Amino acid sequence: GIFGAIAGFIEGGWTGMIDGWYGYHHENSQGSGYAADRESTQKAIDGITNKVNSIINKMNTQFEAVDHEFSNLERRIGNLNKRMEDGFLDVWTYNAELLVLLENERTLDLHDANVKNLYEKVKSQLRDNANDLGNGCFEFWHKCDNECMESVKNGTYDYPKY
């Protein structure tokens, strides 16, 4: 991934976070847990759903081959028909296969970017008050209970306290 987060500085995924694409693992006195970031997950779901549907809609025409026959004295127009039908078959096979390879690459980059930005949103809030361990984890210099955790996730962390 060109953004460097997925299978990058965050080496692996979380099979434990089952309720979304991107999110958090917190650990404090009340214990541990996974939680999806629903805003960035839902935004990605909408974008990718839109992309799938747009591809499906642009591909919703069909070239129609026909059953028509040609006599032994119509070799030229019979072959013209074959070469044309094959002609369109090749451009649409090309269009579909190339599009999928291109879209797949960009889709993975999209997810990679979103994890990166999520990581940046958190680093930007905490600043001095946490230690960035280099792997997507932050160690707080102060006690962070459940409302503190939740204010980091909803993007309203209150730095001047603590």
Partner: protein, 325 residues
């Protein structure tokens, strides 16, 4: 106390390809291509297809005596012609503009058989002896096409000028057939039509036809060295057809009121079974039941089908790279 940022992993082994990398396991993905068919023919728009069974298109539409099963009115969503159908043009000869006829019939939806020229149309000729052992029915060993009549000479008085007329006063075009006989020698000619230069002439407001017998011995086919030149045309609403001949006329007897289709039209050459089922998408090699966007089953279909493509797979990534730990 700590908070970590991370991403979803799961038990997926489903893979996609990208420009940069092959065989990438992703958490979620969707396949856009269908490679699955039901190997059979079904109804389309809840209308049944027409099975020709042991008759070819020509045998069906000419009224080959062994195609009586098909004889009459038909409605079809599409036509299925069996590869080994034996009942076509029984009396040897060429159906002219055969490929255009097939295309015409393929663009249709329904035919209504009706009597266009009763045998009593043709004054002073015999209409009851025009049979041949090249055209057996399932009972008689010498019959003839149900839609044509082989006119021969009476007692021995000379083949008079015969005449027929039909004004198409209906709303539908009429598909009809006729022929010109070409005996192998001049005595067979004389025995059937008498002496003199013979002609077959035909005309509408927009069509002209004129031909003479071309007497010659051709290689034997179904026991005949003679030939028939079969023809077809379409009489449009408001048009009128005049027939004039003094011999060698295979006359139009029955014809077809033709309903052209609003849809596409298909003629499938296949061995596949026709069954009692519905479908929205029917290809020549089977039924597709999908919501998918592409298919690699067949370029040839009737109904609402996905785009045909040569690809084995078109799997789109939706989720992210699967990195479980």
């Amino acid at each position: 106390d700590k908070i970590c940022i991370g991403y979803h992993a799961n038990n997926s082994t489903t893979q996609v390809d990208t420009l940069l990398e092959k065989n990438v396991t992703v958490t979620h993905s969707v396949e856009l291509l269908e490679n699955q068919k039901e190997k059979r023919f079904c109804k389309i728009m809840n209308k049944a297809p027409l099975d020709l069974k042991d008759c070819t298109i020509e045998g069906w539409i000419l009224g080959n005596p062994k195609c009586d099963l098909l004889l009459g009115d038909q409605s079809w969503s599409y036509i299925v012609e069996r590869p080994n159908a034996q009942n076509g043009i029984c009396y040897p000869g060429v159906l002219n503009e055969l490929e255009e006829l097939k295309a015409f019939i393929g663009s249709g939806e329904r035919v209504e058989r009706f009597e266009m020229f009763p045998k009593s149309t043709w004054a002073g000729v015999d209409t009851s002896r025009g049979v041949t052992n090249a055209c057996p029915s399932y009972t008689l060993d010498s019959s003839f096409y149900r839609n044509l009549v082989w006119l021969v000479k009476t007692d021995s008085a000379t083949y008079p000028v015969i005449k027929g007329t039909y004004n198409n006063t209906g709303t539908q075009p009429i598909l009809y057939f006729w022929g010109v006989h070409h005996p192998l020698d001049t005595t067979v000619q004389d025995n059937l039509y008498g002496s003199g230069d013979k002609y077959v002439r035909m005309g509408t407001e927009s069509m002209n036809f004129a031909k003479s017998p071309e007497i010659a011995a051709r290689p034997a086919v179904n026991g005949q060295r003679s030939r028939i030149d079969y023809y077809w045309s379409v009489l449009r609403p408001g048009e009128t057809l005049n027939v004039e001949s003094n011999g060698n006329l295979i006359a139009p007897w029955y014809a077809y009121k033709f309903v052209s289709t609003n849809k596409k039209g298909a003629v499938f050459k296949s061995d596949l079974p026709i069954e009692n089922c519905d479908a929205t998408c029917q290809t020549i090699t089977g039924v597709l039941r999908t919501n998918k966007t592409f298919q690699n089953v067949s370029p040839l279909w009737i109904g609402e089908c996905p785009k045909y493509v040569k690809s084995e797979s078109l799997r789109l990534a939706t989720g992210l790279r699967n990195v479980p730990q």
